N, CA, C and O atoms as CSV, one atom per row, in Angstrom:
chain,resi,resn,atom,element,x,y,z
A,1,UNK,N,N,12.937,12.842,-10.959
A,1,UNK,CA,C,13.283,12.411,-9.824
A,1,UNK,C,C,11.922,11.417,-9.201
A,1,UNK,O,O,12.203,10.279,-8.827
A,2,UNK,N,N,10.889,11.756,-9.138
A,2,UNK,CA,C,10.272,10.354,-8.538
A,2,UNK,C,C,8.674,10.365,-9.914
A,2,UNK,O,O,8.500,11.002,-10.953
A,3,UNK,N,N,8.164,9.739,-9.468
A,3,UNK,CA,C,6.543,9.437,-10.518
A,3,UNK,C,C,5.494,10.435,-10.030
A,3,UNK,O,O,5.583,11.561,-9.540
A,4,UNK,N,N,4.649,9.774,-10.281
A,4,UNK,CA,C,3.091,10.281,-9.607
A,4,UNK,C,C,3.164,8.770,-8.258
A,4,UNK,O,O,2.124,8.457,-7.680
A,5,UNK,N,N,3.962,8.323,-8.077
A,5,UNK,CA,C,3.673,7.647,-6.647
A,5,UNK,C,C,3.542,7.753,-5.613
A,5,UNK,O,O,2.756,7.166,-4.868
A,6,UNK,N,N,4.447,8.681,-5.350
A,6,UNK,CA,C,4.836,9.489,-3.688
A,6,UNK,C,C,2.708,9.943,-3.492
A,6,UNK,O,O,1.909,9.734,-2.579
A,7,UNK,N,N,2.547,10.734,-5.148
A,7,UNK,CA,C,1.564,11.133,-4.869
A,7,UNK,C,C,0.454,10.449,-4.850
A,7,UNK,O,O,-0.503,10.906,-4.224
A,8,UNK,N,N,0.334,8.982,-5.657
A,8,UNK,CA,C,-0.640,7.926,-5.054
A,8,UNK,C,C,-0.671,7.702,-3.721
A,8,UNK,O,O,-1.782,7.565,-3.209
A,9,UNK,N,N,0.420,7.624,-2.952
A,9,UNK,CA,C,0.690,7.499,-1.727
A,9,UNK,C,C,0.033,8.518,-0.662
A,9,UNK,O,O,-0.697,8.183,0.271
A,10,UNK,N,N,0.396,9.694,-0.955
A,10,UNK,CA,C,0.229,10.797,-0.304
A,10,UNK,C,C,-1.338,11.029,-0.515
A,10,UNK,O,O,-1.985,11.414,0.459
A,11,UNK,N,N,-1.944,10.825,-1.668
A,11,UNK,CA,C,-3.419,11.078,-1.381
A,11,UNK,C,C,-4.348,9.976,-0.746
A,11,UNK,O,O,-5.470,10.077,-0.249
A,12,UNK,N,N,-3.448,8.798,-0.939
A,12,UNK,CA,C,-4.838,7.292,-0.459
A,12,UNK,C,C,-4.470,7.659,0.754
A,12,UNK,O,O,-5.549,7.769,1.336
A,13,UNK,N,N,-3.483,7.966,1.646
A,13,UNK,CA,C,-3.716,7.862,2.883
A,13,UNK,C,C,-3.839,8.737,3.618
A,13,UNK,O,O,-3.301,8.934,4.708
A,14,UNK,N,N,-4.818,9.524,2.858
A,14,UNK,CA,C,-5.863,10.784,3.380
A,14,UNK,C,C,-7.253,10.663,3.464
A,14,UNK,O,O,-8.048,10.993,4.344
A,15,UNK,N,N,-7.439,9.933,1.992
A,15,UNK,CA,C,-9.228,9.447,1.594
A,15,UNK,C,C,-10.096,9.593,2.179
A,15,UNK,O,O,-10.175,8.894,3.189
A,16,UNK,N,N,-11.247,10.582,1.883
A,16,UNK,CA,C,-12.436,10.847,2.175
A,16,UNK,C,C,-12.758,9.367,3.636
A,16,UNK,O,O,-13.004,8.987,4.781
A,17,UNK,N,N,-12.477,9.174,2.306
A,17,UNK,CA,C,-12.805,6.917,3.332
A,17,UNK,C,C,-12.035,6.315,3.213
A,17,UNK,O,O,-11.548,6.008,2.125
A,18,UNK,N,N,-11.691,5.968,4.222
A,18,UNK,CA,C,-10.686,4.994,4.498
A,18,UNK,C,C,-11.124,3.405,3.867
A,18,UNK,O,O,-12.080,2.688,4.163
A,19,UNK,N,N,-9.926,3.182,2.815
A,19,UNK,CA,C,-9.936,1.877,2.125
A,19,UNK,C,C,-10.151,0.766,2.659
A,19,UNK,O,O,-9.640,0.502,3.748
A,20,UNK,N,N,-11.004,-0.170,1.961
A,20,UNK,CA,C,-11.092,-1.741,2.511
A,20,UNK,C,C,-9.951,-2.063,3.050
A,20,UNK,O,O,-8.996,-1.327,2.801
A,21,UNK,N,N,-9.789,-3.018,3.760
A,21,UNK,CA,C,-8.573,-3.824,3.712
A,21,UNK,C,C,-8.015,-4.184,2.568
A,21,UNK,O,O,-7.074,-3.510,2.149
A,22,UNK,N,N,-8.460,-5.268,1.863
A,22,UNK,CA,C,-7.518,-5.084,0.512
A,22,UNK,C,C,-7.339,-3.913,0.102
A,22,UNK,O,O,-6.383,-3.512,0.765
A,23,UNK,N,N,-7.746,-2.894,-0.761
A,23,UNK,CA,C,-7.190,-1.476,-1.231
A,23,UNK,C,C,-6.218,-1.007,-0.472
A,23,UNK,O,O,-5.114,-0.826,-0.985
A,24,UNK,N,N,-6.408,-0.760,0.709
A,24,UNK,CA,C,-5.261,-0.444,1.788
A,24,UNK,C,C,-3.871,-1.528,1.257
A,24,UNK,O,O,-2.816,-1.192,0.719
A,25,UNK,N,N,-4.208,-2.483,1.528
A,25,UNK,CA,C,-3.174,-3.643,1.031
A,25,UNK,C,C,-2.151,-3.607,0.262
A,25,UNK,O,O,-0.955,-3.817,0.464
A,26,UNK,N,N,-2.908,-3.239,-0.890
A,26,UNK,CA,C,-2.270,-3.423,-2.171
A,26,UNK,C,C,-1.770,-2.227,-2.111
A,26,UNK,O,O,-0.562,-2.203,-2.349
A,27,UNK,N,N,-2.275,-1.170,-1.867
A,27,UNK,CA,C,-1.648,0.141,-1.767
A,27,UNK,C,C,-0.447,-0.123,-0.919
A,27,UNK,O,O,0.707,-0.271,-1.323
A,28,UNK,N,N,-0.786,-0.153,0.049
A,28,UNK,CA,C,0.008,-0.626,1.520
A,28,UNK,C,C,1.524,-1.292,1.078
A,28,UNK,O,O,2.604,-0.705,1.147
A,29,UNK,N,N,1.307,-2.553,0.651
A,29,UNK,CA,C,2.476,-3.689,0.317
A,29,UNK,C,C,3.424,-3.179,-0.550
A,29,UNK,O,O,4.628,-3.131,-0.300
A,30,UNK,N,N,2.823,-2.746,-1.701
A,30,UNK,CA,C,3.036,-2.082,-3.082
A,30,UNK,C,C,4.151,-0.840,-2.617
A,30,UNK,O,O,5.350,-0.955,-2.870
A,31,UNK,N,N,3.614,0.289,-1.945
A,31,UNK,CA,C,4.372,1.444,-1.492
A,31,UNK,C,C,5.825,0.819,-0.443
A,31,UNK,O,O,7.045,0.960,-0.522
A,32,UNK,N,N,4.874,0.078,0.529
A,32,UNK,CA,C,6.434,-0.311,1.119
A,32,UNK,C,C,7.162,-0.989,0.397
A,32,UNK,O,O,8.318,-0.930,0.816
A,33,UNK,N,N,7.047,-1.713,-0.634
A,33,UNK,CA,C,8.194,-2.488,-1.212
A,33,UNK,C,C,8.753,-1.414,-2.354
A,33,UNK,O,O,9.927,-1.551,-2.701
A,34,UNK,N,N,8.035,-0.452,-2.895
A,34,UNK,CA,C,8.799,-0.095,-4.185
A,34,UNK,C,C,9.687,1.533,-3.361
A,34,UNK,O,O,10.565,2.205,-3.901
A,35,UNK,N,N,9.010,1.784,-1.832
A,35,UNK,CA,C,9.798,2.490,-1.221
A,35,UNK,C,C,11.114,2.367,-0.610
A,35,UNK,O,O,12.218,2.819,-0.914
A,36,UNK,N,N,10.391,1.107,1.001
A,36,UNK,CA,C,11.199,0.471,1.836
A,36,UNK,C,C,12.112,-0.271,1.555
A,36,UNK,O,O,13.302,-0.016,1.738
A,37,UNK,N,N,11.713,-1.161,1.131
A,37,UNK,CA,C,11.328,-2.387,0.364
A,37,UNK,C,C,11.177,-3.842,0.853
A,37,UNK,O,O,9.955,-3.983,0.906
A,38,UNK,N,N,11.733,-4.976,1.230
A,38,UNK,CA,C,11.219,-6.293,1.530
A,38,UNK,C,C,10.651,-6.062,3.337
A,38,UNK,O,O,11.414,-5.990,4.300
A,39,UNK,N,N,9.606,-6.007,3.367
A,39,UNK,CA,C,8.866,-6.332,4.323
A,39,UNK,C,C,9.840,-6.610,5.903
A,39,UNK,O,O,9.794,-7.562,6.682
A,40,UNK,N,N,10.722,-5.284,5.936
A,40,UNK,CA,C,11.469,-5.237,7.472
A,40,UNK,C,C,10.900,-4.379,8.398
A,40,UNK,O,O,11.674,-3.525,8.833
A,41,UNK,N,N,9.742,-4.363,8.833
A,41,UNK,CA,C,9.164,-4.529,10.249
A,41,UNK,C,C,8.481,-5.521,11.401
A,41,UNK,O,O,8.384,-5.445,12.626
A,42,UNK,N,N,8.015,-6.580,10.307
A,42,UNK,CA,C,7.753,-7.712,10.715
A,42,UNK,C,C,6.181,-7.766,11.285
A,42,UNK,O,O,5.484,-6.832,11.681
A,43,UNK,N,N,5.900,-9.061,11.194
A,43,UNK,CA,C,4.292,-9.478,11.313
A,43,UNK,C,C,3.883,-9.646,12.984
A,43,UNK,O,O,4.392,-10.307,13.890
A,44,UNK,N,N,2.466,-8.519,12.912
A,44,UNK,CA,C,1.856,-8.720,14.195
A,44,UNK,C,C,1.999,-9.258,15.353
A,44,UNK,O,O,2.707,-10.261,15.447
A,45,UNK,N,N,1.393,-8.741,16.431
A,45,UNK,CA,C,1.460,-9.497,18.116
A,45,UNK,C,C,0.442,-9.128,18.870
A,45,UNK,O,O,0.219,-9.915,19.789
A,46,UNK,N,N,-0.232,-8.242,18.812
A,46,UNK,CA,C,-1.415,-7.680,19.785
A,46,UNK,C,C,-3.025,-7.751,19.178
A,46,UNK,O,O,-3.864,-8.646,19.280
A,47,UNK,N,N,-3.082,-6.373,18.482
A,47,UNK,CA,C,-4.757,-6.783,17.979
A,47,UNK,C,C,-4.667,-7.256,16.605
A,47,UNK,O,O,-5.464,-6.924,15.728
A,48,UNK,N,N,-3.786,-7.952,16.458
A,48,UNK,CA,C,-3.635,-8.187,14.946
A,48,UNK,C,C,-4.478,-8.173,13.995
A,48,UNK,O,O,-4.294,-7.802,12.835
A,49,UNK,N,N,-5.619,-8.668,14.581
A,49,UNK,CA,C,-6.793,-8.503,13.501
A,49,UNK,C,C,-6.957,-7.673,12.608
A,49,UNK,O,O,-7.189,-8.433,11.668
A,50,UNK,N,N,-7.030,-6.298,12.045
A,50,UNK,CA,C,-6.699,-5.851,10.767
A,50,UNK,C,C,-5.363,-4.762,10.839
A,50,UNK,O,O,-5.270,-3.535,10.816
A,51,UNK,N,N,-4.409,-5.868,10.935
A,51,UNK,CA,C,-2.947,-5.322,11.003
A,51,UNK,C,C,-2.390,-6.683,9.938
A,51,UNK,O,O,-2.133,-6.557,8.741
A,52,UNK,N,N,-2.290,-8.042,10.785
A,52,UNK,CA,C,-1.993,-9.296,9.937
A,52,UNK,C,C,-1.564,-8.745,8.116
A,52,UNK,O,O,-0.551,-8.407,7.504
A,53,UNK,N,N,-2.789,-8.898,7.874
A,53,UNK,CA,C,-2.949,-8.900,6.213
A,53,UNK,C,C,-2.099,-7.627,5.489
A,53,UNK,O,O,-1.447,-7.765,4.454
A,54,UNK,N,N,-2.240,-6.339,6.253
A,54,UNK,CA,C,-1.036,-5.514,5.780
A,54,UNK,C,C,0.124,-5.801,5.682
A,54,UNK,O,O,0.787,-5.299,4.774
A,55,UNK,N,N,0.771,-6.812,6.716
A,55,UNK,CA,C,1.695,-7.344,7.103
A,55,UNK,C,C,2.109,-8.400,5.678
A,55,UNK,O,O,3.069,-8.197,4.934
A,56,UNK,N,N,1.307,-9.319,5.576
A,56,UNK,CA,C,1.457,-10.300,4.879
A,56,UNK,C,C,1.148,-10.213,3.482
A,56,UNK,O,O,1.523,-11.138,2.761
A,57,UNK,N,N,0.322,-8.935,2.826
A,57,UNK,CA,C,0.430,-8.482,1.791
A,57,UNK,C,C,1.802,-7.854,1.171
A,57,UNK,O,O,2.335,-8.158,0.103
A,58,UNK,N,N,2.197,-6.958,2.071
A,58,UNK,CA,C,3.215,-6.485,1.782
A,58,UNK,C,C,4.359,-7.352,1.691
A,58,UNK,O,O,5.208,-7.313,0.800
A,59,UNK,N,N,4.320,-8.269,2.833
A,59,UNK,CA,C,5.276,-9.469,2.534
A,59,UNK,C,C,5.213,-9.922,1.584
A,59,UNK,O,O,6.157,-9.690,0.830
A,60,UNK,N,N,4.307,-10.641,1.172
A,60,UNK,CA,C,4.033,-11.527,-0.219
A,60,UNK,C,C,4.666,-10.965,-1.697
A,60,UNK,O,O,4.577,-11.563,-2.769
A,61,UNK,N,N,5.473,-9.370,-1.414
A,61,UNK,CA,C,5.667,-9.095,-2.784
A,61,UNK,C,C,7.710,-9.024,-2.213
A,61,UNK,O,O,8.632,-9.180,-3.013
A,62,UNK,N,N,7.817,-8.863,-1.293
A,62,UNK,CA,C,9.371,-8.827,-0.595
A,62,UNK,C,C,10.296,-9.730,-1.780
A,62,UNK,O,O,10.529,-10.908,-2.047
A,63,UNK,N,N,10.652,-8.343,-2.294
A,63,UNK,CA,C,11.608,-8.621,-3.277
A,63,UNK,C,C,10.670,-8.382,-4.835
A,63,UNK,O,O,11.105,-9.022,-5.792
A,64,UNK,N,N,9.816,-7.768,-5.004
A,64,UNK,CA,C,9.461,-7.045,-6.210
A,64,UNK,C,C,10.148,-5.970,-6.733
A,64,UNK,O,O,10.803,-5.284,-5.948
A,65,UNK,N,N,10.123,-5.598,-8.274
A,65,UNK,CA,C,11.164,-4.931,-8.767
A,65,UNK,C,C,10.327,-3.218,-8.107
A,65,UNK,O,O,9.297,-2.673,-8.504
A,66,UNK,N,N,11.171,-2.851,-7.153
A,66,UNK,CA,C,10.461,-1.220,-7.031
A,66,UNK,C,C,9.993,-0.642,-7.417
A,66,UNK,O,O,9.403,0.187,-6.724
A,67,UNK,N,N,9.900,-0.622,-8.589
A,67,UNK,CA,C,9.759,0.108,-9.926
A,67,UNK,C,C,8.038,-0.473,-10.225
A,67,UNK,O,O,7.171,0.305,-10.625
A,68,UNK,N,N,7.786,-1.854,-9.967
A,68,UNK,CA,C,6.815,-2.287,-10.737
A,68,UNK,C,C,5.770,-2.190,-9.362
A,68,UNK,O,O,4.559,-2.013,-9.490
A,69,UNK,N,N,6.304,-2.304,-8.323
A,69,UNK,CA,C,5.566,-1.426,-7.116
A,69,UNK,C,C,5.351,-0.235,-7.315
A,69,UNK,O,O,4.214,-0.098,-6.861
A,70,UNK,N,N,5.667,0.714,-7.683
A,70,UNK,CA,C,5.183,1.897,-7.959
A,70,UNK,C,C,3.924,2.297,-8.946
A,70,UNK,O,O,2.865,2.854,-8.657
A,71,UNK,N,N,4.424,1.804,-10.245
A,71,UNK,CA,C,3.850,1.766,-11.685
A,71,UNK,C,C,2.233,0.893,-10.755
A,71,UNK,O,O,1.116,1.411,-10.765
A,72,UNK,N,N,2.488,-0.140,-10.222
A,72,UNK,CA,C,1.081,-0.995,-10.103
A,72,UNK,C,C,0.868,0.108,-8.851
A,72,UNK,O,O,-0.298,0.443,-8.640
A,73,UNK,N,N,1.297,0.346,-8.508
A,73,UNK,CA,C,0.321,1.208,-6.693
A,73,UNK,C,C,-0.138,1.791,-7.224
A,73,UNK,O,O,-1.250,1.304,-7.426
A,74,UNK,N,N,0.038,3.322,-8.021
A,74,UNK,CA,C,-0.597,4.301,-8.765
A,74,UNK,C,C,-1.570,3.639,-10.081
A,74,UNK,O,O,-2.792,3.785,-10.125
A,75,UNK,N,N,-0.847,2.970,-11.015
A,75,UNK,CA,C,-1.918,2.244,-11.623
A,75,UNK,C,C,-3.320,1.564,-11.329
A,75,UNK,O,O,-4.307,1.415,-12.050
A,76,UNK,N,N,-3.031,1.163,-9.870
A,76,UNK,CA,C,-4.407,0.691,-9.064
A,76,UNK,C,C,-4.976,1.964,-8.088
A,76,UNK,O,O,-6.150,2.164,-7.775
A,77,UNK,N,N,-3.942,2.656,-7.755
A,77,UNK,CA,C,-4.430,4.005,-6.443
A,77,UNK,C,C,-5.860,4.158,-7.334
A,77,UNK,O,O,-6.918,4.093,-6.709
A,78,UNK,N,N,-5.880,4.312,-8.446
A,78,UNK,CA,C,-7.216,5.346,-9.492
A,78,UNK,C,C,-8.480,5.270,-8.544
A,78,UNK,O,O,-9.217,6.157,-8.113
A,79,UNK,N,N,-8.471,3.568,-8.330
A,79,UNK,CA,C,-9.492,2.909,-8.200
A,79,UNK,C,C,-10.076,3.795,-6.844
A,79,UNK,O,O,-11.244,4.183,-6.865
A,80,UNK,N,N,-9.141,4.105,-5.601
A,80,UNK,CA,C,-9.350,4.700,-4.498
A,80,UNK,C,C,-9.302,5.830,-4.767
A,80,UNK,O,O,-9.537,6.525,-3.778
A,81,UNK,N,N,-9.051,6.538,-5.901
A,81,UNK,CA,C,-8.971,7.956,-6.153
A,81,UNK,C,C,-10.656,8.327,-6.604
A,81,UNK,O,O,-11.255,9.395,-6.483
A,82,UNK,N,N,-11.069,7.192,-7.083
A,82,UNK,CA,C,-12.136,7.311,-7.963
A,82,UNK,C,C,-13.727,6.895,-6.681
A,82,UNK,O,O,-14.900,7.238,-6.531
A,83,UNK,N,N,-12.891,6.139,-6.164
A,83,UNK,CA,C,-13.952,5.613,-4.719
A,83,UNK,C,C,-14.141,6.519,-3.023
A,83,UNK,O,O,-15.048,6.805,-2.241
A,84,UNK,N,N,-12.572,6.700,-3.150
A,84,UNK,CA,C,-12.577,7.270,-1.896
A,84,UNK,C,C,-11.788,9.052,-1.878
A,84,UNK,O,O,-11.903,10.008,-1.110
A,85,UNK,N,N,-11.122,8.844,-2.950
A,85,UNK,CA,C,-10.257,10.555,-3.298
A,85,UNK,C,C,-10.249,11.314,-2.096
A,85,UNK,O,O,-10.822,10.966,-1.064
A,86,UNK,N,N,-9.213,12.956,-2.332
A,86,UNK,CA,C,-9.381,13.277,-1.457
A,86,UNK,C,C,-10.450,14.698,-1.165
A,86,UNK,O,O,-10.650,15.094,-0.017
């Protein structure tokens, strides 16, 4: 059906600690691409400060091989799972 990806996701979005913007970004961007696809949300407007980046990082992908997005997402999440975990 699926791999460990939604798992990676599921875990990461809960984590004891809330990952740094970039950690969240990688995850986010890739998940969003692997799942939703091509940043179809749009770039921020009000308290942009800690949002933009997520937008941009996902955007940066906008068309990556979804599968890769998953692989990568998990393949990298490990760090979060080792640093933050549930």
